[model samples]
Target chain A: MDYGMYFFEHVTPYETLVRRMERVIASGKTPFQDYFLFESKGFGKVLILDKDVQSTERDEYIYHETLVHPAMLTHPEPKRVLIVGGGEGATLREVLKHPTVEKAVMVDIDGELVEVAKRHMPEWHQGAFDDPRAVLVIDDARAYLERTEERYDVVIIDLTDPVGEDNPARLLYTVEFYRLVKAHLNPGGVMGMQTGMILLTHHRVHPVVHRTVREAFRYVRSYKNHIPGFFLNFGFLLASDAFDPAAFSEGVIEARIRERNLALRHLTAPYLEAMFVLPKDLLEALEKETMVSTDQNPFYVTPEGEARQAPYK
Target chain B: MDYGMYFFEHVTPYETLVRRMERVIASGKTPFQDYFLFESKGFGKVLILDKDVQSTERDEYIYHETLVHPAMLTHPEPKRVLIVGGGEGATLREVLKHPTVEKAVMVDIDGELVEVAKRHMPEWHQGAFDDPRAVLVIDDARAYLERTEERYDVVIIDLTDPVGEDNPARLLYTVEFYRLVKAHLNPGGVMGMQTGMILLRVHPVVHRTVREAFRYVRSYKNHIPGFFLNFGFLLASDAFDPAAFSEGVIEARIRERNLALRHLTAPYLEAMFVLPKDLLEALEKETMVSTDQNPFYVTPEGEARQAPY
Candidate 1:
């Protein structure tokens, strides 16, 4: 009854009470591995985890703009783009803003996710999935990457954290997956992927993911933006064959915005150019790690060089 | 009336709704200042502040430990200590850990706050004030600091953000107060005070306090600990005629514990000794400011210059 007191037992009556309370508060529903529409307070109706829609008071545009514009504006002319796991259709909405993007193909394993977005989270998706230039495919992303003959100018992997029942998603950070991604890229194509939280998830998987992506691509970089509810900050990894993000300028963003015929608001060309500046602590962490490549997932080493490949049993 | 809809004008309405809902959930009681104690499913009784409690989670401990231990543990023998503005009583609990600490005098400005701790938030204070050796003085902390002449081994300050109604407490960070503390020291006494938060607080106050204290003091350093409800870290200043903190080791802790400690254990001593290696970034800002050392008055500019002084 005294909830503030710490309990000694591994499975106390308090735990059960809390679990039941959570179920009731969460509306006695658990989401399956499919996309669903949830009404949120700030972002309006949002496409959420396949089920259990809830209202939120936070803005979703801040997240979408930060996720898409940084890497999109950095690339000179991304004609063909591939989005790996944005089933909510928000990424496609952002990607379609570019006039240079002639073809955008989204490959997500869950087809119901896209369906949910088309229905419930329309405000967030902005009807970009129905665009004439976009093509939606429901397939295993790894297998699709291996089999597709067409190479893409930009690839964005927006997978979830490498926990949960989705154990296969862990392979995305492996040497084999990086090699597959590199083999299917256009000569000057750039790649960016959602790398989860820098504070919480980075220590576990970022080093390996960075190293693996670096081996496959010539230049590998990581950047972050604040997203309050999902995590304090969400990290994104950018890698390219010939592009130098440091050389990115405002003129390039203006040129891209003009070329794409985008609405020309919210994320102005100047704002896109300024997003690359990193804080000192993050810059230090980036410089300290070794460049992981397609042939080597060097991120698998412990702080003391012990192997950390096996999942905690 | 759609709670799920997003509208600019609805922000105020939503906040009002959330506040009313939180008050109802908290049994209609404001816990700490503008904060409410919400009983969450996973986190237990969560202290939810209406304002942003800067330095979320990562660097809270760095402030709490540094502000408490240096003065309490510095003396060859410290039995009676005084804490000002630590209404949460965390510092009081920390001081009572010293075996030499026979009594601890805790003076906070808010009696309602002390009562809140007594009723709803006992876990935070850890029942330190309820101990027979503890004395709770609810009054203006500055007055208590000015009037008290009972020589104490340590005087730990754990005040709020150095602005608003608590601005008078700023005087406690000046040279005159340090002199008072020095005069009140039991031979070789030390004083630890909460300067302010490192990141969000006006940078000048901490700089001025540290600078003024270091001029007449020997061991002047900062430490941080995970006190999630507050800012990045609380500043602790230890003033002795010739005391070196490096000389105060595990053996000193053990000998002191053998004589009178209840809460401070060997593991806690070893953990607290891990000092912050990085110079606080705010120190750079302090280096450029001039020190202000007057009695019963410290301006925002004075706090900035308190560092490196």
Candidate 2:
């Protein structure tokens, strides 16, 4: 009934009632961030890197599918794909669902977290890391983007939250990194990632990240989806010059799902419209503020620890 | 950064956090439950009773407007209105917005909480308690429903989460009590309430209990914007089909009413009806219908999230 060794942070920290907090299954220090894997109570195996929740097995499908399938469904033959920060291979698993994919390369900054996930979180990665077409590159994603000559049908960035102060992925949220992704895209390519939680918390990084990507891409689709464990709506941005996930028909999406035999649990065809819709309050604010994040001035994205002050006597 | 004492609950038992546990301005034991009013770090003054959060001054408009407007807009000329358990008068504040409303009555069991709101929560009640059209009744809502012959154009249930085991509002969520509220409704009238969280937490009482009374019910929704708090609202009726009000019609109705609203807009009103398909499927397959006899979650065993596979 009461297991209290750790507390999880929402706006601030909240004591979680875990029935059990299993031993650190695999943990290692990387130059990028701290990596650890542990089993939770109601939520199963959870991967935490740099004190930020990366993925939970309980609702990993919701996060990975929302990150992968929006662009995966849009492209007819998503053969060549590049995944930026997916250490868990959940993004890779969702990408490999497209049978036409001949090559898939995953570039993560920390190689240790990728190995910890490969060794411990089989339920999440599901042998996708060792898939014949999959290439796991243990290097910085932006550097990989700068050097790679090959083009990609899709690019997924599944990094941790831009925790504001001293983030490893700080530069990745700027316009330059998005331009790096843009140069690596194929003709009808799109790029997507688990952006931020934009629902109730007034996430500081979401609008700026969305606006930053808007500068590099011709059109952007702002999406919000629910992952069960978080009890919060997760924000995701899908950017492309040509492929708009919302523009495709339900018939086409269903036909693609059937064709690939992708056993999607959360991204239901009937509910595709729900993914693209953002809350009105956030949408209104995003419209009024035309600010974007550049490497020169990533000033406005605040960190996620301060308590919200009340507005009354 | 650590709590001295004050804490808030997201789920009944899960501990919610802030940098400091702010001071409690006023706390007391009412005849029913212990009521405490405190300043939250971000949410403004919040009133808590029986360890359950009732209202926060910061986001009260989000909850109150969503509870009142969906059904209020459906009825072209809603005049006679009654609110069942809104002790703070926020529901009454929203009800008083329509110029067409001739009479507004609020029946809440705890007289102490109502008086406390009048004194401490001016933003929520906002002179609605003293309005010429308003009637404040301090008595059990069930008892009032049993005795009154008054028919209402609209009835709003603004009770706390039916934590089910020992809630004063337990019987109020049952089918028999829904029938009691129905008996007092005018010919084509409707009643609405904050059903539950619709995003991930699938609330049991929302569809099953509300639909058990054989009223044409719809889950008119406007999500409470943040946290896990959602306004998965339920509107029940005997003669009106709530789905008949098209998205554009709801928008038009809000403009026609000329209500100086805060959080809700015409665009927001139109999107209120977009219920997630996952929640809808859960409602369709869910067979546990609660009556006055078999109220759901009547014990602690029904509470925590079950172990995940």
Candidate 3:
């Protein structure tokens, strides 16, 4: 037992988030990034990618449920769903819960990490990867979206944060990429993505990402949910052309959940409505952003990433 | 220039919260506790007492607004109010905002800390100490509650965490103490207090304590970035249910008062009382209650015996 051992994540250049690791379950590095699976007294089992927290066993349900249910439920009948980069498989797990979902195609670039999660994070995957209707494709999500001729009723981008210039995944968060995702979406289609941290302390990326997603879709709604494991409130956005998540009534949302026979731990009818209600000050702060994350200008710096001249190679 | 002089508070026996102090504004100790006033790079001005974070200049609004508004708004007309152990005066600042409040009595044990905050944290008190309607009593809250013949329409308990046996403030959190406060409440009075962290990862005992003394108790939480957790709060009433107020009722009252708030809104009100399923279930399963003989404390010795994690 490593009682004194801790993992300190620099949430900002100044503020650091410290977690006491009870035990180290596994640690390794793939061709792309570093990975660690550890047990903590507070959050139980936690998985980290490149020193950034991915999910915790105690509350991954809240994160996955918020990300998947809003978009999947927004679509009346999501028969064909495509997940861009949910390597953890929890997003796929939530999607397969919808009885209307006929097939769920998950495209991730890191097949090795997926395999690692399959071996280590049983509580997260929960045999979701082996579901008959779940399809796993190991390829770059951008390339997969660009090449696939098939359309989807819903698309969920569960990628990591768009960190730096070297991160090719930064291309996935641009307006051009969201437009590509929209092009692959069928009529009445909906999409959801993990935007970034939207808080009073560090929220520069969220508004820009929201602006980028809005440029790509006719309707967009962003919400924040607290992730206890990460010790931060994470922002998520649901974008669509026709379906507005903010317009759904409580009765309508409840009816859909009952009809789908879905059992959700989070994302109750009232809670779903609560997610759309942003704090007054936060909404006002988000309104001040005038930038957009594009291929030519992306969010690639630490602590309020500034947009600079750049292009997707 | 203390750029890397980090102040790490152990949130749990295991988890630690790290904050970088850009500069140290002041540091000293009172007869009761040690205190530090510093400038943080992220949270701006932060006041720490006995190593516990009291308030930050940036987002103290969220905490004070949450602790004061719910109970104040729940009552129909709160003319007089009582606050226990809110030395920061932000709680008093929030309480005086209600135009209906005719008199506000604040009882704090640490007069030294109050003088310190009065000198340093002007943004927190914001001249509420000079308000003609505000009465500041430098005394123990329990002694003051027991001696006062007057009653209040609302009472707010803004004390530091009841840590252990050595702490005299631990006596104020027991059921017997709540019964004393209940005796001091006028008809249809409401009370609110800051509870400890009620996450899925930890235990919640304060909600159980309030439930023993009141007919209706509502638990709610809001995320405080400075504290690095979603801090829990409880609103309790004997004649009225705290959760029974509709959006129109709360919104109309706020509008009638012409109270301009920075964080609390009708939509935020609708969402504040909703708890996660796991936390709800966890509260439902909690059986232990704090008492005069065996009180709840926020330390490992106080809670670790029952902690599931």
C-alpha RMSD by candidate, in order: 14.1, 5.0, 2.7
True contacts kept of each: 0.00, 0.08, 0.69
Candidate 1: stretches off by over 4 Å: A1-37, A46-58, A200-203, A264-266, A288-308, A311-313, B1-57, B60-309
Off by over 4 Å in 3: A1-3, A303-313, B1-3, B201-203, B301-309
lDDT of each: 0.53, 0.72, 0.82
Per-residue CA lDDT of model 2 for A72-93, tens digit only, reads 8878889899998888888999
Name the docking class for model 3: medium
Enumerate clash totals for all models, in the order shown.
39, 3, 0
Two-way DockQ contest, 2 vs 3, winner: 3
Question: RMSD to the native, candidate 3?
Answer: 2.7
Whole-structure CA lDDT of model 3: 0.82
lDDT of 1 by residue, B100-126 (tens): 678888887768756765677666677
Q: Score the docking of each candidate (DockQ).
A: 0.03, 0.22, 0.56
Name the lDDT of candidate 2.
Answer: 0.72
Highest-scoring model, TM-score: 3
Per-prediction TM-score: 0.50, 0.88, 0.95
